[PDB]
Every structure is written in C-alpha cells, then in structure tokens.
C-alpha cells in the first residue's frame, strides 16, 4: 500500500479562507462570535421605535415584539469616502449594501489577503437577498422620488456594487429563495469554482428589517412565534423570530489555497439543492419529508462519503411544531440506521442563538459550521429544556448539543448543513475538516516557537500602520494600545510584526513604529519628540 | 527613521523582504508561513471613520405608528387638525366594545366621542357647549372601519 | 346617586377616564325612566 | 400568472405532455427584478392580508412553477436587472 498521490480529484474540494459578518448580539469577527456562542449568547432583543412602533404587537398585528437585530445605528453607519461614494449618494444606498461592503473589506482583512492584490482578477460574487425594506421606505410617497433611488437600492447592486468596488470580474448575481438564498449562493459559488469559470468566489447573503409590512404578513399566517423566543426542537416551539444582519465568505480552490498557505477553515465536499415541488406535499408552505431526504441522499452520494461518517448537522430547526419533527424524521431515515445511542448524531441550530435569519440563514449556518470545524469543537444550543414529544430521539439515535463538546482527536469530522426555504427549496452541503493533518503539525509549528531568545530576535523592527483617514489610523493604534495585556500572552511579537507587514494593505495615511516586543511597543509607541 | 520617512512620503516599502521576514532562505516550513496567519486572528479589523447617513420621508414615520389603542387615533398632519382612526373590535385594545350590544349590533359608544374630545385637548379644563349624535356607528367583525 | 366601578378596559389603557366609565355614568340617569322603551342618546349640553 | 400560463403553453409547444414530466428533476431558473404588484398591495399598512407575501415574494416566481409541475431540479430566481433572464439561461446551461 502507498499513501502518496492523494489529490482533490473532485472539483468539489473548495475551501473557506475567511469570513465577515454583522450578526445580532454584536458578533463582528470570528473570534468574538465564537466566544459568544460558547457562552450561550442570546441575540434576540426588542425591536425599537426606529423600525416600527410597539403599538403593532400589543394589538397583535405583529404577533411578537422581539427580533434578533443589530443596533439600529450599526445599520446607519458607513464611510462613503473610503469606497468613492460621494456623500450626496450615501443616503440613497441600501443599508444592506453598506453592510456588504464593510463586512467584505473586513473579510478580506481577515483572510490575510490585501484587496489590492485582487483587483482586476475574475472572482465571482454571489450574494443573497429577498427584501427591499429601505426601498419601500423610500417609496412611501410618489411625489418626491429623487433619481438616485433605484441605483442605490435595486436588486442588481447588492452584488454588482461589491464587484465594481473591488474589480471582481467573475459572474455577479444575487439570489432569492428567501430562507435558503445565501446557501444557494454558496452552491453557485462552488459551481463557478468547479467549472473553471473563476479561481475564487465570494459568497454571502444579507437581510435588513426596516418596515413592519413583511413582518405583519408573516405573523398573519402565524409563522412567527408568539412569546418572542426562538426555541428549537422543544415543546415550546411556537414560531421563528425574524432577524437582521448579513455576511460573506471567501471560497478558493483547495489546491490554490494550500499552495499560498492561507488559514483554511474547512473544505466543502459539495452538495446539492433541490425543491419539494409536489412530492408528498399538500401546498406551497409545507416542507416535504421525502424531498429533504432525497436532497440529503444526493449530497451524500456526490460528496463521496458514508452517512456513517457524519458527526454533526446544522439543522434548519426553526421552532415550529410542524416543520421541526418533519425535517428531523427526514434526517433520521438516513442516519438512524448508522449510529448508536452511545455515539449518536449531533444536531443544532444557529437560529436558537441569534434568532432566525430571514434571508441570511445560510451564511449564518455556514459561518457557525466553519467556526466549529476550525476550533475542533461543538457550540452549545440554547432554549433547550424539554424535547418536543413528536421527536423520537432514542428511537433514532439522535442527540442535541447541550454543552460544548470537543472533537475526538483521532477521526476526520464531516458535518452537513441543512436550510429549507419556505417556498419548498432545500439546499444542503457537506462540509469537513481540512485534510491537512494537525496531529503531526506540532513539529513544524514549534519551529518558530522556542526560537525567540536568540539575539537576532532582540532586533527592533519597523512595524507599519496604514489607513485611509487619519482618524481611522488613530483609532486602530489606540485599539492596539488598549490591549496591552491580552496580546502579550497569546501572540509572540514576531508574529505580530509579520502580520502588520503582510496582511495589511498600504493606504494613504502611513505610519511607522519601531519596537522589539510589547513593552518596547508601548514605550516607543510614538517618536514625535521634536521631529 | 529614514525608511520610516520614505514610507510616509509616498515611497512603497517591501517591509517583508526588507527585514527578511518572509522566507528568503530555502528552508521555511508550513508553520513559518501560517503561524502568524493563525495567531493574529484576534487583532482588531480596519476601524472605520463612521458617519451616519439615513433618509426616511416623514410619511414613513407617520405610517410606522401602526394602529392606536385609544379611540382618538393617529394624526394626519394636514390643515385644521385631523384625527383619523381604524377600528377592528376583535382586536385587544378595542375588545371591550363588543360588550356594547344593541339590537344585536356592536354600536359605537356615545361616550367614545367624549373620550376623543378629552384626548385631543388633553390636560386642560374643557367645556363642551353642545354635542349631538345624529347617525349610529355600527362595528362589524373583522372589517376595519 | 351611585358608585361607579373603576377598572381598565385593556392592559394598554392607562388614562384616567375610559370611554366605558363615561358611558356607564349615564346608566344612573337611565335607571330613572320606567316602562318599556328603546332609548338612544340624542344630545348633551354644557359639559365641564 | 404569466409564468404558469406561458409555461404550460411552452410545454404544449414542445410536443411534451407535462404529465410525463411530473416527479422528474428539471431545474427552474427564472429572472425578475421588480415587485410592482407587491408595492401596489402595500400602499397601506393597515389592511395587509396574510396571503400577500406568499403570492408576491421573490421565491415564488420559480418555486410556484416548480410546485405546479413537480420539477425537482434546483429552483432559483435572478436579478441583474437588464440581463437577468440571460444569466438564468447561463445557469440552466450550467445545471445541465
């Protein structure tokens, strides 16, 4: 036997090299979001006066007065000078697009890639969206309308604005299929990477809530919860709260990503997305057991894995007493034959933690699974005090994560992502740990460790700091100073020098600082003495 | 200091190759390429010079007030003051009206006009010189009057 | 002369005088008429 | 309404009885950018009946056809306003 010559023969091996998000509860960067999930953060809060009055809920026009929202100023804030958006055009730009641009630049900053190196190179941009709430706020009167509305709020611009702002020449689309739109975009990105269209694909989805219209219409059909807390897989399941936010992830061919040595969260082994249609179905808004079963089976076959090697699934559990048992039994028919209660199949739902994302649920689940894969652990699940009696747990060898669980240190982990739109669409993907082993990675990672005592390490470096405006640079450096204690213990100063040298891009407000460690950094923080 | 100033004044500096940070030697393992890539994740991202932009026509503000618990209703800002209102007695804030059954119809209270009078002129000593109820107001079920 | 109960008509009503109280206040006057009738209000003058 | 009627007409044109195509995976990519009927509905936010979104949302342009003909393929709908349907043509070529 020979272990050599193993290759990503599937063009269904596409890695995720970074992300960026604005999720309810304050998640803004993978580390903080991870620390928030591990502490059972509940992003559900109260929808303030800004979106709509409270008078709706008390008269049960909008059945619940809760929602997983960003702070309402975090929708408003922007920096239109940075992206060449004249402030005359800023008010007419959709806040969803503002979120996309800001979080996309943040995602690039995360992915150790300077956007300057990516201008003029084909890189597809698939984003998801279903609502135009800001546009309907604009169109409350048809006597004013200024000619810069549509160009700031149309469907095209959600993706095309990013494309124009970053010279990404790949195919640029935006997707509906409301509840699974962004996950559909993930699939389309995988498509556009596998078929040789492009060497990189940026994929995400957004969802903004700025008008009570859609919320009232959903509450009328009693899809939304009545108490106000999203509660997955329990008896208290009464409906799913609607939330805000958005995000993106950067996908790059696995061979290319390992070739340049970037931080690989996970590897998509592929998947499929189909639709209920009329199979075992009564009408539109009634998820089909058989359809989701077939979707799971097709994705499993294409990914070239066995159902006996699925360690987790990001269930689409909303908190409806109707759909949750249906989809759980659908999962059961596939997996209950290949697990035992001592080592069952674990499920979960980010919808519990952050509320249900109405249109960006796909990217929420994708980011959560990517984080859980990178950190080799499973996040807890909240609001889980009593299982819904319609769910047969021990009869199906199915378990729900209740506490943080560490991965076994000897088995490759495969996890599946489920998210069904209300219009019947089901989109599922199989994600997995990056196939680069980390048990033997200790020897090579210890090569820079235990090597800080040499005299060449006492050399003081010239760490740059770059930003567009002066105030941004000052904010950055003040933030760096304020964390003197945290960084001194987890990051060797040499790694910080490498990071500030390579990861950041060169912007106009350039600054240089000389230091050799953290104490030297705080000491020579500035050299403004007489020059 | 010289390199600092040339970087500041517009000259691009390859700081990486300058200090031999990146692998300039033949041997540099996978850890040497990605150790900082994995350890610097906690660093703050690009701080933005945040400015607040927003534009909602006041009509949208006048629409987002939704229904009104009291019987005065919400204000249509126009000319002489104008107090509009929609009623669906099945709802919670007007459910008590269903107790006013007359000849089998949920008739609007006579004193509802008095309450509206007091509300519109809240917090002042008031005199109603006269008040005349001419036509009856019938409130059906599930129809917004 | 009669005692009028005081209870809010709805959990969202927190003003002093509900319409219900004001309308009920006319019941004492109405009691004073006797014999079968179909009485509907028509006017009221000089409320303070 | 136009999509369903013209889709049945297209099947009648294509010498294919839709009965033979029920329950067989056949992707459905359609294009759309406007929701003018929905905005006509939402001229007032005191009435809105709970059957509006399910009759006018983005999802349903393609998913309604899919549910009405048992086409189990991937079902999406595309913006990119002036070339949306042609983009859908490309996506259909992809899915085939």
């Amino acid at each position: 036997m020979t272990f050599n010559n193993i290759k990503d023969e599937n063009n269904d091996d596409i890695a995720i090299i970074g992300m960026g998000f604005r999720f309810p509860g304050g998640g803004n960067n993978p580390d903080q979001f991870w620390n928030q999930l591990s502490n059972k953060m509940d992003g559900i809060s109260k929808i303030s006066q800004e979106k709509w009055s409270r008078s709706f809920y008390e008269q049960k026009y909008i059945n619940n007065e809760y929602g997983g929202v960003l702070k309402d100023e975090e929708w408003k804030n922007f920096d239109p000078l940075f992206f060449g958006i004249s402030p005359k055009e800023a008010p007419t730009i959709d806040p969803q697009q503002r979120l996309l641009m800001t979080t996309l630049w943040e995602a690039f900053e995360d992915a150790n890639i300077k956007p300057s190196t990516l201008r003029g190179s084909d890189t597809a941009v698939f984003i998801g969206m279903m609502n135009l709430d800001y546009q309907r706020c604009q169109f409350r009167d048809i006597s004013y309308i200024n000619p810069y509305t549509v160009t700031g709020s149309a469907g095209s611009f959600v993706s095309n604005r990013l494309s124009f702002s970053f010279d990404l020449r790949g195919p640029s689309m935006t997707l509906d299929t409301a509840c699974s739109s962004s996950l559909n975009a993930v699939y389309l990105g995988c498509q556009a990477i596998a078929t040789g269209d492009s060497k990189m694909a940026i994929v995400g989805g957004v969802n903004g809530i700025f008008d009570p219209s859609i919320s009232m219409t959903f509450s009328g059909l009693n899809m939304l919860g009545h108490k106000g807390q999203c509660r997955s897989f329990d008896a208290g399941a009464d409906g799913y709260i609607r939330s805000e936010g958005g995000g993106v992830c950067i996908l790059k061919k696995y061979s290319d990503a390992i070739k340049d040595g970037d931080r690989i969260y996970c590897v998509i082994k592929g998947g499929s997305s189909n639709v209920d249609g009329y199979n075992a179905k009564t009408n539109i808004t009634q998820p089909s057991m058989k359809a989701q079963g077939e979707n799971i089976e097709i994705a499993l076959k294409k990914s070239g894995v066995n159902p006996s090697d699925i360690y987790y699934i990001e269930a689409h559990g909303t908190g409806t007493p109707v759909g949750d048992p249906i989809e759980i039994e659908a999962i059961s028919r596939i997996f209950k034959d290949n697990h035992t209660p001592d080592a069952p199949l674990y499920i979960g739902s980010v919808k519990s933690n952050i509320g249900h994302l109405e249109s960006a649920a796909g990217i929420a689940s994708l980011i959560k699974v990517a984080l859980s894969l990178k950190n080799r652990s499973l996040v807890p699940n909240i609001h889980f005090e009593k299982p819904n009696p319609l769910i047969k747990f021990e009869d199906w060898n199915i378990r729900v994560v209740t506490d943080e669980i560490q991965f076994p240190t000897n088995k490759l982990i495969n996890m599946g992502i489920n998210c069904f739109g209300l219009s019947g669409s089901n989109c599922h993907m199989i994600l997995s740990e990056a196939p680069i082993n980390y048990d033997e990675l200790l020897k090579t990672t210890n090569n820079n460790s235990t090597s800080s005592s040499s005299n060449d390490d006492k050399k003081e470096y010239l760490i740059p700091f770059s930003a567009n405006c002066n105030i941004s640079l000052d904010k950055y450096i003040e933030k760096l100073i304020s964390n003197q204690s945290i960084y001194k213990d987890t990051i060797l100063f040499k790694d910080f020098v490498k990071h500030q040298t390579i990861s950041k891009s060169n912007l106009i407000k350039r600054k240089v600082i000389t230091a050799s460690d953290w104490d030297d950094f705080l000491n020579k923080r500035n050299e403004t003495t007489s020059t | 200091l010289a390199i600092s100033t040339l970087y500041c004044n517009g000259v691009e500096i390859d700081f990486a190759s300058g200090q031999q940070l990146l692998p300039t030697s033949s041997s540099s393992g996978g850890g040497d390429i990605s150790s900082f890539k994995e350890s610097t994740n906690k660093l703050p991202r690009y701080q933005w010079d945040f400015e607040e932009y927003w534009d909602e026509p006041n009509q949208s503000k006048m629409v987002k007030r939704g229904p009104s618990n009291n019987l005065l209703g919400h204000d249509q800002f126009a000319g002489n003051t104008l107090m509009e209102l929609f009623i669906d007695i099945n709802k919670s804030a007007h459910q008590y009206l269903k107790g006013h059954k007359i000849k089998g119809k949920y008739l609007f209270p006579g004193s509802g006009y008095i309450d509206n009078i007091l509300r519109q002129f809240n917090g002042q000593d008031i005199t109603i010189f006269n008040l005349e109820f001419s036509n009856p107001f019938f409130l059906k079920d599930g129809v917004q009057h | 002369f009669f005692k009028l109960s005081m209870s809010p008509c709805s959990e969202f009503d927190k003003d002093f005088l509900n319409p219900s109280i004001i309308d009920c206040a006319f019941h004492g006057l109405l009691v004073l008429s006797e014999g079968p009738q179909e009485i509907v209000f028509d006017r009221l003058q000089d409320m303070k």
Side-chain angles (χ1 to χ4, degrees), chain A residues 61 132 136 139-140 142 155-156 172-178 184 188 191 195 197 211 213-214 216-218 220-221 273-279 283-284 422-423 425:
Chain A
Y61 279 70
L132 305 159
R136 223 173 301 113
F139 293 156
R140 278 313 161 182
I142 318 188
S156 286
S172 160
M173 341 275 280
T174 312
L175 307 191
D176 57 1
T177 88
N184 272 109
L188 274 187
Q191 274 268 113
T195 72
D197 259 27
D211 193 285
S213 166
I214 327 301
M216 293 181 344
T217 300
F218 284 153
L221 301 179
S273 39
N274 46 33
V275 54
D276 292 10
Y278 201 76
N279 205 356
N283 61 349
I284 278 302
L422 77 99
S423 285
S425 306

Side-chain angles (χ1 to χ4, degrees), chain B residues 53-80:
Chain B
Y53 306 88
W54 202 247
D55 172 24
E56 41 172 356
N58 48 5
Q59 175 80 317
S60 182
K61 272 189 180 72
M62 271 156 268
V63 173
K64 295 169 176 152
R65 308 174 266 168
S68 63
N69 317 324
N70 60 69
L71 286 92
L72 185 55
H74 277 133
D75 196 308
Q76 263 69 17
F77 293 124
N80 314 307

Side-chain angles (χ1 to χ4, degrees), chain A residues 116-373:
Chain A
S116 304
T117 202
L118 290 193
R119 305 203 56 143
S121 50
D122 63 305
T123 292
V125 181
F126 301 97
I127 321 286
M129 160 273 263
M130 51 175 282
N131 262 25
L132 305 159
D133 265 325
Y134 200 85
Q135 177 169 53
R136 223 173 301 113
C137 274
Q138 292 298 301
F139 293 156
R140 278 313 161 182
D141 202 334
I142 318 188
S143 51
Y144 317 149
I145 303 173
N146 54 356
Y148 272 66
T149 312
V150 58
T151 85
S153 185
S156 286
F157 293 74
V158 156
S159 52
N160 287 315
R161 191 154 296 254
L162 312 165
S163 182
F164 150 74
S165 290
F166 300 85
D167 247 9
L168 313 183
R169 323 179 164 283
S172 160
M173 341 275 280
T174 312
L175 307 191
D176 57 1
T177 88
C179 193
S180 87
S181 153
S182 77
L183 203 38
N184 272 109
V186 187
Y187 174 55
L188 274 187
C190 172
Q191 274 268 113
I193 277 185
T195 72
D197 259 27
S198 54
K199 282 90 175 161
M200 195 163 342
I202 282 177
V203 160
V206 74
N207 168 28
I209 290 193
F210 318 109
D211 193 285
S213 166
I214 327 301
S215 313
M216 293 181 344
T217 300
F218 284 153
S219 59
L221 301 179
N222 276 288
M223 281 166 268
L224 322 177
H226 266 290
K227 56 180 76 56
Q229 300 166 10
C230 173
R231 170 162 285 145
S232 168
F233 306 150
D234 283 28
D238 65 342
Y240 72 96
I241 317 297
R242 259 179 67 226
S243 285
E244 274 161 343
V248 280
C249 282
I250 291 96
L251 321 178
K252 175 174 181 167
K253 298 198 197 168
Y254 180 85
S255 80
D256 304 349
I258 180 179
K259 195 263 293 180
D260 299 349
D262 304 346
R263 196 159 58 85
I264 292 171
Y265 281 76
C266 52
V267 182
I268 283 167
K269 300 254 203 333
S272 69
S273 39
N274 46 33
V275 54
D276 292 10
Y278 201 76
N279 205 356
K281 204 182 195 212
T282 44
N283 61 349
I284 278 302
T285 319
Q286 205 58 225
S288 148
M289 255 204 82
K290 182 174 199 175
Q292 312 179 343
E294 293 196 5
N295 198 171
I296 286 300
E297 179 41 38
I298 286 174
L300 276 200
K301 180 261 303 182
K302 164 134 66 203
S303 88
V305 311
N306 301 319
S308 265
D309 301 339
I310 291 308
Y311 184 70
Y312 182 94
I313 286 181
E314 190 68 23
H316 185 67
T318 69
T320 303
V322 167
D324 278 0
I326 283 183
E327 80 94 12
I328 287 296
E329 186 154 4
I331 282 176
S332 156
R333 223 151 281 161
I334 315 297
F335 296 105
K336 96 177 189 54
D337 311 330
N338 315 268
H339 304 291
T340 39
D342 55 353
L345 164 59
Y346 296 163
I347 65 188
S349 175
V350 61
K351 278 88 182 153
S352 72
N353 281 121
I354 88 163
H356 176 89
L357 297 204
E358 154 220 322
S359 187
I363 190 51
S365 277
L366 206 59
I367 286 174
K368 175 197 169 302
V369 63
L371 274 193
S372 46
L373 269 186

Side-chain angles (χ1 to χ4, degrees), chain A residues 22-28 32 36 43 45-46 48 50-51 67-77 99 210 244-245, chain B residues 50 52 54:
Chain A
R22 290 301 206 243
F23 275 177
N28 326 306
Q32 200 191 49
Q36 269 186 340
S45 324
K46 304 276 210 153
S48 93
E50 218 277 335
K51 314 210 188 299
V69 308
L70 313 187
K71 273 185 315 296
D72 61 7
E73 47 88 8
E74 201 170 8
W75 271 123
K76 285 164 177 157
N77 288 352
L99 206 176
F210 318 109
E244 274 161 343
Chain B
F50 263 176
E52 202 145 40
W54 202 247

